[PDB]
Design a protein around this ligand. Sequence first.
Ligand SMILES: CN1CCN(Cc2ccc(-c3cn4c5nc(ncc35)NCCCCC(=O)NCCC4)cc2)CC1
Ligand SMILES: [Cl-]
Ligand SMILES: [Cl-]
Ligand SMILES: [Cl-]
Ligand SMILES: [Cl-]
Length: 260
Amino acid sequence: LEDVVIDRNLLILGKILGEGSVMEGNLKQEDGTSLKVAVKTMKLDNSSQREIEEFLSEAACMKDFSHPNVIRLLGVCIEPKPMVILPFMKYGDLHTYLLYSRLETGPKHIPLQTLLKFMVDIALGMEYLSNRNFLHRDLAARNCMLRDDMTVCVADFGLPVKWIAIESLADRVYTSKSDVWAFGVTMWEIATRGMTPYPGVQNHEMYDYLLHGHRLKQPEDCLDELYEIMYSCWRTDPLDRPTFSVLRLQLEKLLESLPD
Ligand SMILES: CN1CCN(Cc2ccc(-c3cn4c5nc(ncc35)NCCCCC(=O)NCCC4)cc2)CC1
Ligand SMILES: [Cl-]
Ligand SMILES: [Cl-]
Ligand SMILES: [Cl-]
Ligand SMILES: [Cl-]
């Protein structure tokens, strides 16, 4: 607590940004200046201090995370409900951004070079968490945030059937190679500019679908080289899947093989 806790009086809450749930707010910092934050309210099982122990545990680790492509944890505040304090990012989540991209008034058609750069950013972020054996367990375009410099950072980690790896559906187990699987789905979302995974397949059909060897199909405008990287993320054996440090360099290489 000594490290992550923030006095509730230093926090002012405002409108709802999404539904626990997310809310806007102002964090009064130690330099006197006030910072805009997003406050994620957390509903935990208070029948025991079990879930809160694991809550304050990760938060202490998450507050020490420092990487441009990984979201920053500012701290936690208590009411007795905990609340995660994160930086506010006005450009919002990447998923909505991709959709807007396909509408006039909204952002310009995102070229492929920019789409890969989104993937690289996420891969770099995941590479950082992976190096610290920290699992995300909920990676998706909706959880990837755009910084004010339009660089992507990963979020919502710590503390969705169509993103869950095949092993994690049956055995109900989670490894970093399960995050790689979700990362490949995230790549698909980006390459399709916001499509929902597995059109035609309902959620209750996903296990038999995957179990029979069927995977996400290649988008029309997607390069064979880019879909290879995506596909390698969905290999049945988690050991056959590449690490984030391999994926990251694959994407950096491919992006550099393109013009501006
Ligand atoms: C007066 N106006 C208010 C509405 N404005 C537009 C707008 C609306 C919503 C958001 C927004 C939404 N989410 C956000 N998460 C964060 N910052 C902003 C948002 N950081 C925390 C990230 C942690 C992970 C997470 O929860 N991922 C899901 C995204 C949830 C941003 C801008 C215009 C002005
Ligand atoms: Cl308040
Ligand atoms: Cl940050
Ligand atoms: Cl769509
Ligand atoms: Cl599909």
